[PDB]
């Protein structure tokens, strides 16, 4: 199939809804858009959203790694050799997982078009659709319930709530919300490293009481020893996010005694579908459930993540809302949202429309 | 691309060279041959050689799992959906890994032909070629040297020597063999679960002194705890065979403290290329070396093992001699032997010829 050409550009996306995360805040996001064209005319798409506090990858570095000069070795390479290409991406873009993921997506986009089916069918289909959470950032009780209701009306059945580590505020938000929802959506929480050992045992008791489904990354990334020191049943209700970048992390967390029961895979953390799939093999073997999450991102990479997600039997949760609050985007299609569930189209490849 | 027909038959192959394994003694072999034709005329090939003592799969059970009536679910299925098809093989033939492999093989053969490249390039190429060992069964000192010399003459640079557990005979054979070869070939050994703990330490001292590359399965398959009680440096020179069936075993042996340093993968154990590649992912992350082994088998499955092996960066060794001593076969091609080294032809798919 033969790569002819590659274009890379910066795109600025302001958010319709700015929000707060633990020791942070976000009004807008930059992505890198990648276009890979085939000798015979086909177009693969990819998108990068580097997260520096997690992977160490700056936007400057991401863009650097995608510079036209540094990509020459891809010219004229045969996309049917995709897994070899993915290995070489890992070797030539060792420090830029988001950049690497962008190219990786695009190649998966093209190989599926070559074969003639939606990418998911090519990776083998484990699922037709799944519910996705939408995110509520850090904010006071009234505002929280206010956003909660907006989301219910847009038809979402799952809410992901960010916690700040102040137990008084965190707990009252969760109790009020549980009340206000009256069983209309389930809830998952994300303290984002802000808790401590005694704190989490407390939060976990609430979580059981309120029927919250799991707790995402309660302790600091390096603190996985704190996780293993918890009773096994509590560990099953905890997901690793910032602790989990690639397959090496997956294996280390999965090794007995296992650190947790859920992995949150993000393309921008691991560097594309190929490494994400290695994570899934490890997780499935270890009896660990997969959650597919994201950064603030164009529909392009959300779609890529969805196709991967629906191809893994171990996939259980989706947190795929990264493109919803974008003020504009550079592509349409790739997935369909209906009544809170995410689905792919019947179009070949990623199914994106330019 | 749409499966159209599936045909299955028993073939009886006598050996040109009968041989003894610890507790066993083989004079001939039966294989099941599997032909999958596409609606467009394309032909996939697979071969099953069930090993009952290792997998519990008998020839009868294997044949039964391939009955034309038990295979109806595959008709009309699209081979471009291969990973999904393989997941189903696992559900529908859970107790018959050889039969599963035979179908898995054939399907990979077709997807590769669909794309139009040798299977190995579709899987992404990690290697051009590797040396293979040839096997010397249990037999006295003189006949061992005689067989070694026959093999040197045919150009092999690596010999795999079966040990029986009797140290006086085992050690004498290895010492003599070392002397007879000059540097002409490296030697690897395979006690097949016949050693105890005190004896293995004795064997390992010899192995270091004689420059033998490693020891395959010194202990009973269930005695994994004996491995972990060894110093790490010794564990690195040990390969797992009968202890390793599928990915579940792979993870178990790989998790810290790791039981051994090398996995011996066999399609007839794990159930085909799909599970085999799952083992490879685990092994690579754990820093375990891969060796691809076999039973007495037609070129068909040897070829398939070869494509898979040349596609995994973790592969360090081949023991692929399973089709050499067959008095007849049903196919040609698929791999080329030169000067002890195995390599694949340039033809698409498995590259077999009828
Ligand atoms: N660096 C991204 C911040 C959040 C990451 C993630 N939580 C989420 O809920 C993501 N879906 C956030 C990105 C989606 N966009 C919006 N506006 N919520 C995490 O678990 O760390
Ligand atoms: N129970 C497994 C039977 C084979 C044993 C295998 N040893 C080998 O040497 C393999 N290459 C088998 C094929 C050898 N074929 C001939 N004709 N010598 C093992 O590792 O247990
Ligand atoms: Mg998190
Ligand atoms: Mg063995």
XYZ file of C-alpha atoms in Angstrom, chain A residues 11-313:
303
model
C -4.883 23.323 15.825
C -6.207 25.466 18.642
C -9.491 24.329 20.292
C -11.105 26.442 22.999
C -13.438 24.620 25.369
C -17.107 25.558 25.581
C -16.856 24.539 29.269
C -13.673 25.324 31.272
C -13.077 23.080 34.287
C -10.882 22.372 37.319
C -8.705 19.330 38.034
C -6.606 18.650 41.155
C -3.884 21.340 41.301
C -4.673 22.573 37.732
C -7.303 24.173 35.453
C -8.172 24.117 31.708
C -9.823 26.674 29.361
C -8.463 25.456 26.007
C -6.424 22.750 24.316
C -3.934 22.393 21.444
C -3.792 19.167 19.400
C -1.464 18.124 16.602
C -3.321 16.791 13.536
C -1.609 14.176 11.397
C -2.471 13.319 7.799
C -0.898 10.288 6.135
C -1.606 9.775 2.477
C -1.301 6.637 0.404
C 0.322 6.379 -3.035
C -3.085 5.459 -4.463
C -4.862 8.320 -2.650
C -6.196 7.063 0.719
C -5.998 9.248 3.841
C -5.303 8.072 7.397
C -5.961 10.492 10.250
C -4.341 10.856 13.653
C -4.346 13.371 16.479
C -1.980 14.091 19.356
C -2.718 15.564 22.790
C 0.486 15.429 24.871
C 0.064 15.434 28.650
C 3.298 16.633 30.213
C 2.597 16.112 33.915
C 1.869 12.454 33.146
C 4.200 11.315 30.351
C 6.764 14.133 30.479
C 5.923 15.086 26.872
C 5.549 18.816 26.130
C 3.603 20.239 23.171
C 6.916 21.646 21.949
C 8.466 18.173 22.065
C 5.440 16.531 20.551
C 5.524 18.889 17.608
C 9.260 18.472 17.293
C 8.972 14.703 17.047
C 6.498 15.099 14.183
C 8.682 17.541 12.209
C 8.672 16.789 8.477
C 12.412 16.159 8.492
C 12.266 13.568 11.271
C 9.586 11.547 9.468
C 11.414 10.792 6.198
C 12.047 7.158 7.080
C 8.276 6.487 6.805
C 8.118 7.502 3.145
C 7.444 4.607 0.828
C 6.968 2.121 3.657
C 4.225 -0.490 3.135
C 1.288 -0.097 5.557
C 0.548 -3.845 5.377
C 3.657 -4.239 7.554
C 1.920 -2.220 10.289
C 3.226 -4.065 13.345
C 6.831 -3.623 12.139
C 6.114 0.091 11.623
C 4.692 0.353 15.124
C 7.828 -1.199 16.632
C 9.908 1.348 14.695
C 7.726 4.215 15.985
C 8.601 3.096 19.514
C 12.291 3.180 18.604
C 12.290 6.561 16.819
C 9.828 8.396 19.096
C 10.765 6.917 22.487
C 9.879 10.034 24.562
C 6.763 11.280 22.716
C 3.822 8.846 23.227
C 1.207 11.350 22.006
C 3.079 12.033 18.770
C 3.718 8.288 18.382
C 0.009 7.597 18.984
C -1.032 10.080 16.274
C 1.011 8.236 13.613
C -0.004 4.853 15.027
C -3.757 5.727 14.725
C -3.333 6.949 11.172
C -1.626 3.745 10.077
C -4.372 1.686 11.730
C -6.858 3.922 9.899
C -5.170 3.090 6.557
C -4.653 -0.643 7.085
C -8.341 -1.048 7.836
C -9.316 0.933 4.748
C -6.997 -1.266 2.713
C -8.740 -4.358 4.098
C -12.136 -2.714 3.579
C -13.844 -2.812 7.001
C -14.288 -0.599 10.083
C -11.064 -0.715 12.160
C -12.787 -2.482 15.042
C -13.803 -5.452 12.830
C -10.163 -5.797 11.767
C -8.912 -5.807 15.372
C -11.737 -8.307 15.972
C -14.984 -7.167 17.516
C -15.593 -7.727 21.184
C -18.456 -5.206 21.657
C -21.178 -3.314 19.799
C -21.375 -0.295 22.161
C -20.756 0.870 25.730
C -21.910 3.659 28.038
C -19.460 6.523 28.404
C -19.042 8.782 31.414
C -18.938 12.538 31.149
C -16.773 14.526 33.490
C -17.651 16.957 36.244
C -14.582 18.920 37.385
C -13.891 20.289 40.856
C -16.576 22.787 41.968
C -19.051 23.616 44.836
C -22.160 21.493 45.503
C -24.760 23.659 43.729
C -22.700 23.919 40.529
C -22.066 20.150 40.628
C -25.761 19.255 40.741
C -26.299 21.904 38.056
C -23.889 20.208 35.649
C -25.215 16.802 36.676
C -28.678 17.738 35.433
C -27.435 19.216 32.133
C -25.694 15.896 31.441
C -28.712 13.778 32.351
C -30.717 15.762 29.811
C -28.172 15.095 27.084
C -28.896 11.466 27.854
C -25.774 10.300 29.720
C -26.141 7.420 32.194
C -22.706 7.661 33.858
C -20.912 10.549 35.583
C -17.263 10.807 36.499
C -16.709 13.193 39.391
C -13.389 14.815 40.198
C -12.492 14.999 43.887
C -9.903 17.375 45.414
C -8.849 15.508 48.538
C -10.730 17.681 50.985
C -12.939 15.024 52.520
C -15.601 17.419 53.782
C -16.233 18.940 50.360
C -15.692 15.627 48.480
C -18.132 13.650 50.643
C -20.977 16.190 50.695
C -20.758 16.513 46.902
C -21.110 12.748 46.581
C -24.030 12.460 49.003
C -26.005 15.321 47.510
C -25.399 14.058 43.997
C -26.449 10.498 44.875
C -29.678 11.968 46.272
C -30.350 14.237 43.274
C -29.702 11.442 40.749
C -32.172 9.032 42.355
C -30.727 6.071 40.457
C -30.781 7.870 37.064
C -26.995 7.521 36.460
C -24.149 5.681 38.160
C -21.113 7.497 39.466
C -17.356 6.941 39.398
C -14.884 9.170 41.225
C -11.406 10.466 40.406
C -9.391 11.956 43.354
C -6.432 12.192 41.034
C -3.614 11.324 43.492
C -4.966 13.651 46.193
C -5.824 11.133 48.944
C -3.898 9.436 51.740
C -4.092 6.033 53.355
C -6.599 6.741 56.131
C -8.565 9.012 53.795
C -9.111 6.373 51.128
C -10.470 3.779 53.555
C -13.020 6.432 54.508
C -13.839 7.306 50.892
C -14.125 3.630 50.051
C -16.746 3.184 52.798
C -18.825 6.000 51.309
C -18.320 4.503 47.848
C -19.777 1.178 48.992
C -22.668 2.984 50.750
C -23.519 5.207 47.734
C -22.936 2.450 45.142
C -20.223 4.430 43.315
C -18.624 1.976 40.861
C -14.867 2.518 41.363
C -12.201 4.979 42.569
C -9.655 6.188 40.058
C -6.011 6.723 41.135
C -6.490 7.688 44.795
C -2.803 7.886 45.726
C 0.264 9.379 44.033
C 1.606 7.632 40.909
C 4.731 6.286 42.641
C 2.786 5.067 45.653
C 1.651 1.667 44.252
C 2.982 0.090 47.465
C 0.143 1.917 49.272
C -2.280 0.104 46.933
C -0.959 -3.402 47.601
C -1.205 -2.719 51.335
C -5.007 -2.426 51.009
C -7.352 -5.400 51.398
C -7.909 -7.219 48.130
C -11.625 -6.305 47.846
C -10.892 -2.576 48.047
C -8.130 -2.971 45.468
C -10.674 -4.469 43.039
C -12.649 -1.199 43.167
C -9.646 0.930 42.277
C -8.388 1.957 38.839
C -4.845 2.902 37.863
C -4.450 5.916 35.620
C -1.324 8.029 36.167
C 0.385 4.894 37.549
C -0.178 3.183 34.215
C 1.579 4.403 31.077
C 2.650 1.367 29.046
C 2.765 -2.433 29.075
C 5.707 -2.377 31.503
C 3.518 -0.534 34.055
C 0.601 -2.876 33.325
C 2.728 -5.907 34.076
C 4.191 -4.365 37.275
C 0.695 -3.508 38.578
C -0.747 -6.860 37.525
C 1.971 -8.975 39.133
C 0.786 -10.656 42.344
C -0.169 -9.274 44.627
C -1.999 -7.116 42.064
C -2.145 -3.393 42.780
C -5.683 -2.831 41.488
C -8.659 -4.180 39.533
C -9.053 -1.698 36.681
C -6.612 -0.164 34.184
C -7.328 3.153 32.500
C -5.684 3.023 29.073
C -5.037 6.232 27.178
C -3.454 6.341 23.733
C -1.663 9.562 24.706
C -0.062 7.724 27.635
C 1.052 4.502 25.926
C 1.762 5.749 22.388
C -0.945 4.261 20.139
C -3.113 1.181 19.510
C -0.176 -1.209 19.318
C 1.076 -0.616 22.865
C -2.527 -0.303 24.133
C -3.179 -3.775 22.784
C -0.217 -5.181 24.678
C -1.646 -3.661 27.864
C -4.948 -5.406 27.144
C -3.341 -8.822 26.796
C -1.624 -8.438 30.136
C -4.792 -7.160 31.812
C -7.000 -9.909 30.431
C -4.577 -12.593 31.514
C -4.421 -11.069 35.007
C -8.212 -10.754 35.315
C -8.140 -6.978 35.309
C -10.847 -4.835 33.753
C -10.101 -2.254 31.076
C -11.314 1.350 31.069
C -10.595 3.490 27.993
C -10.015 7.119 28.893
C -8.731 10.286 27.280
C -7.302 13.774 27.312
C -9.116 16.758 25.809
C -8.941 15.602 22.199
C -10.327 15.860 18.687
C -12.938 13.299 17.605
C -10.096 11.744 15.613
C -8.254 10.172 18.539
C -11.427 9.553 20.510
C -12.569 7.439 17.578
C -9.283 5.628 17.472
C -9.638 4.811 21.165
C -13.214 3.649 20.703
C -12.333 1.204 17.918
C -9.539 -0.244 20.052
C -11.867 -0.424 23.068
C -14.600 -2.293 21.263
C -12.052 -4.861 20.041
C -10.930 -5.970 23.553
C -12.952 -8.564 25.416
